[PDB]
Ligand SMILES: *[C@@](O)(C=O)COP(=O)(O)O
């Protein structure tokens with residue numbers, strides 16, 4: 001089994017991680033870490049390093065990879081949550097896809113019934129399409145990485161489950177993403193505009209003229225598709241039931257301070273991502289957006305798809321302090 | 337100009353770097369750093385993050401990117417060296433290619449003639465082909481990255497120019513690499529075995545059967561092509577002349593301790609690199625090689641080539657302490 005070989009490789013390469021079997025999931029070698037909220041996510045394999053490369057201090061306590069582009073089953077999520085539970089509750093970050101919501105929601109209920117204090121955060125940052133192939137609402141993509149880091153920092157500093165959940169939901173309402181593909185993981189000089197991370201169709205197929213023009217279209221779309229009202233359910237652990245909550249996003253606007261993530265979907269040369277970033281900085285400056293921090297590289301991929309995404313997340317001083325906080329994971333590492 | 341855009345993007349993304357114009361090169365924003373040996377390298381663009389992503393504390397003082405797959409001109413190298421010169425000498429790391437050797441050697445003479453104490457280290461780690469299209473001897477490839485980190489740590493801590501040069505030369509005789517391509521940046525189910533980083537042909541074209549079988553062929557080749565005797569010239573700054581020095585490499589053998597670098601040449605998914613690493617650890621264990629540290633990711637690329645390389649570098653306790661020493665660059669970051 002190739003997936004078995006890949007996870008074995010991950011484990012051998014990173015002694016800070018523990019690979020579990022029966023069922024398979026990955027945790028920090030030091031979990032459970034007593035006295036801190038534990039943070040967990042997961043989803044299909046094929047988006048590496050999301051989510052296993054984000055396991056470590058200041059980020060995820062553990063993650064649950066599934067088969068390629070397929071959500072992990074509920075047993076994996078339940079066992080991973082039980083293993084990382086430090087007695088202060090477990091926060092589940094769930095990307096918005098039919099399969100992930102179903103499986104993570106089922107695990108949430110199993111956890112609650114086993115006495116674990118748990119709650120959830122749903123990620124729906126992809127501004128391209130409402131009601132895609134495998135999503136009710138908007139797709140969860142690269143902003144998931146930014147939210148994992150920020151909520152990770154808050155959990156590491158000792159914030160409560162409620163505080164971490166509330167921060168995650170607020171960040172979700174302030175982050176906006178869009179991706180394009182020049183080739184699947186199929187048209188020649190044409191791009192799939194607003195593509196999804198498991199290959200879902202975008203807004204349309206349109207001609208690729210240049211990098212700068214593609215970035216302009218992506219950026220313009222982030223500015224005009226920002227406004228969004230929708231229901232996102234979260235687990236209320238006090239009542240032991242799903243709570244329907246109306247959630248609102250405001251469009252990105254002049255005067256906003258943002259973190260920018262220019263993300264390789266798989267086979268885009270890093271030199272090109274820097275070209276993207278150069279045009280993005282120009283457009284942000286023209287629109288009154290101040291990019292305060294950035295990440296450029298392969299953070300939320302789709303196998304070997306040729307393409308990239310842009311994520312802009314609105315932030316303030318407190319959120320920037322959470323960004324600057326230490327993180328020690330395979331894919332992201334910085335100290336004070 | 338696209339390269340101009342990509343370099344502007346790199347500079348905007350990293351306040352720790354300074355992009356210079358007339359001529360173009362990149363340095364640490366804090367260079368010149370007084371009292372420490374300055375370390376520089378360069379070469380064609382198209383290998384990002386090599387070398388610009390290695391500029392920072394514990395690594396390069398600066399780098400000189402050229403046009404795609406083309407050495408920078410001698411004025412870029414000279415001016416970059418003068419900008420970073422901290423009064424204790426400049427060490428130039430040169431990958432073994434006709435153009436790079438000619439240009440860095442010309443810059444070396446100009447520096448010497450301008451009063452700057454300088455010396456060189458040539459990297460010739462690719463075991464696949466001797467006397468490729470653009471190289472006299474063996475090609476300089478991914479081990480260049482490991483050497484910049486290790487010699488970068490030595491310079492950072494205050495080692496002398498001679499000590500840093502001797503270390504670089506010793507490490508060059510102990511690092512061995514090989515790369516394969518499944519697609520250029522041409523055959524279907526076939527691979528170019530022993531491919532070079534600017535697209536140079538390899539040993540041959542052969543069938544691709546599986547990932548594990550490919551790793552086996554690559555690993556076997558590193559074990560059997562290790563032995564090597566050749567001349568590498570270096571700049572003797574006391575005499576003001578090139579010194580022809582015979583240099584010897586021993587094959588990798590049972591009992592060796594190594595750092596392993598599994599490197600994406602451009603479009604190989606990270607998941608697959610972990611599978612490569614998994615098989616590599618098995619082969620190393622069988623051969624009596626102990627892998628003490630690893631790096632898995634995109635570190636020395638070839639635009640969007642689909643393929644990867646494996647590098648094994650023999651090390652001892654002193655070299656592993658240099659590996660673990662602090663580094664703060666765009667591509668490599670750790671304080672332990
Ligand atoms: C995708 O890999 C994100 O986790 C898997 O989602 P679905 O299986 O489509 O829910």
Ligand SMILES: *[C@@](O)(C=O)COP(=O)(O)O
Pocket residue numbers: 378379380381382383404405406407431433434435436437470534
């Ligand atoms: C290649 O990008 C390594 O720097 C460029 O080498 P040559 O110009 O072929 O020497």
